[PDB]
Amino acid sequence: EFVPPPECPVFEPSWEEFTDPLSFIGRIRPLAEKTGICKIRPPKDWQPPFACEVKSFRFTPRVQRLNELEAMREAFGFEQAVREYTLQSFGEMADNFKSDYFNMPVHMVPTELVEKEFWRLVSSIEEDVIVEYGADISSKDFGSGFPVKDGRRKILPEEEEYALSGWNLNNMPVLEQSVLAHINKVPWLYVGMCFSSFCWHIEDHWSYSINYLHWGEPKTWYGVPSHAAEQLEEVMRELAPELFESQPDLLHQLVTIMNPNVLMEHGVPVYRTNQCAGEFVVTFPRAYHSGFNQGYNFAEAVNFCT
Ligand SMILES: C[C@H](OCCN1CCCCC1)c1cnn(-c2cc(C(=O)O)ccn2)c1-c1cccc(-c2ccccc2)c1
Ligand SMILES: [Mn+2]
């Protein structure tokens, strides 16, 4: 069965250390860059409100078949596809799926069991599980999960500090330095369900990324330090299908699903974490990462530069 990778570092900064995100990330970098990903728990009293317009939040999630690669059928390409949800109707669907699958209330399912079942389903040719992921939803559509002082929604006085916080993902620096920037991005939202996932990838321009789970069940992460990036790519090339082996990385990254134990068997260091509600995950430059959701949750993410 699946062997869980060792845990990535978790930081619990003081109020003093929590003042500037880039300053804090610079200081933890000697350790966190050696694990690729790390988790940051804000001070207990730091609780931003959820500012998305939930009334009109409607979306069509992407259909994901967990075992599509291992499955390499009559009328293929028409198995399942788009259907619009609200945040509420998606959550009802998500909870019903998980509780029916495990035959228990969703919050009683151990995280280690969903993890073991996810990787079993990914490689199983006998059971075909299909889930849905409301993801790559632009925050410019229904607003950010964080309050923003843009004059499009009410902000109570006690929420102003979160609209102005450096840990508000809308306030991260995103402009990359270049001479082209002298001659010449927004957060994305992720509505997960049980087993919805993201495959192994790095960010464009090898950027940092920062990720906040606003609410819901945990998001399980795997990360690989940047010094092992080429080792992971070599393992990918050896074990990937021949038809996908020669594809450009940006396209190959669409189907780069691989059990972490396989990477670990080849000597690639992999670290894991369960990002719970109210916690940040930071990925460092060229740190490959992948993961899946334990249940109905809501995440916000952006690439930033230092
Ligand atoms: C590379 C990719 O660019 C997304 C920007 N797009 C904007 C629109 C045009 C096209 C590019 C990207 C970046 N970050 N990122 C990610 C996501 C999570 C998460 O899901 O929590 C955690 C950590 N990182 C991912 C990602 C990686 C693999 C898979 C999926 C995915 C698959 C199917 C359905 C939904 C999402 C997303
Ligand atoms: Mn990413």
Swiss-Prot record:
Q: In terms of domain of life, where is this protein from? A: Eukaryota
Localization, per the record, is:
Nucleus, Nucleolus; Nucleus
Sites where the protein binds Fe cation: 201, 203, 289
Instruction: Give the binding site residues for 2-oxoglutarate.
Output: 133, 209, 211, 219
Q: Where is the JmjN domain?
A: 8-49
- Where does the JmjC domain start and stop, copy by copy? 161-306
Mutagenesis or variant effect for residue 195 to V: In NEDEHC; uncertain significance; decreased protein expression levels
Task: Indicate which residues form the motif GSGFP motif.
Answer: 143-147
Its domain comment says: The GSGFP motif is required for the interaction with SUZ12. The ARID domain specifically binds to the CCGCCC motif and is required for the lysine-specific histone demethylase activity. The PHD-type 3 zinc finger is required for the interaction with histone H3 di- and trimethylated at 'Lys-4'.
Associated pathology: A chromosomal aberration involving KDM5A has been found in M5 type acute myeloid leukemia. Translocation t(11;12)(p15;p13) with NUP98.
Family to which the UniProt record says this protein belongs: Belongs to the JARID1 histone demethylase family.
What is the annotated quaternary arrangement, including any partners?
Answer: Interacts with SUZ12; the interaction is direct. Interacts with the viral protein-binding domain of RB1. Interacts with ESR1, MYC, MYCN and LMO2. Interacts with HDAC1; this interaction impairs histone deacetylation by HDAC1. Interacts with BMAL1 and CLOCK. Interacts (via PHD-type 1 zinc finger) with histone H3 unmodified at 'Lys-4' and (via PHD-type 3 zinc finger) with histone H3 di- and trimethylated at 'Lys-4'.
Q: What does this protein do?
A: Histone demethylase that specifically demethylates 'Lys-4' of histone H3, thereby playing a central role in histone code. Does not demethylate histone H3 'Lys-9', H3 'Lys-27', H3 'Lys-36', H3 'Lys-79' or H4 'Lys-20'. Demethylates trimethylated and dimethylated but not monomethylated H3 'Lys-4'. Regulates specific gene transcription through DNA-binding on 5'-CCGCCC-3' motif. May stimulate transcription mediated by nuclear receptors. Involved in transcriptional regulation of Hox proteins during cell differentiation. May participate in transcriptional repression of cytokines such as CXCL12.
Q: Please identify the protein, giving its name as recorded.
A: Lysine-specific demethylase 5A
What is the protein's species of origin?
A: Homo sapiens (Human)
From which lineage does this chain's organism come?
Eukaryota, Metazoa, Chordata, Craniata, Vertebrata
- Portion of the parent chain present: 12 to 588 of 1690
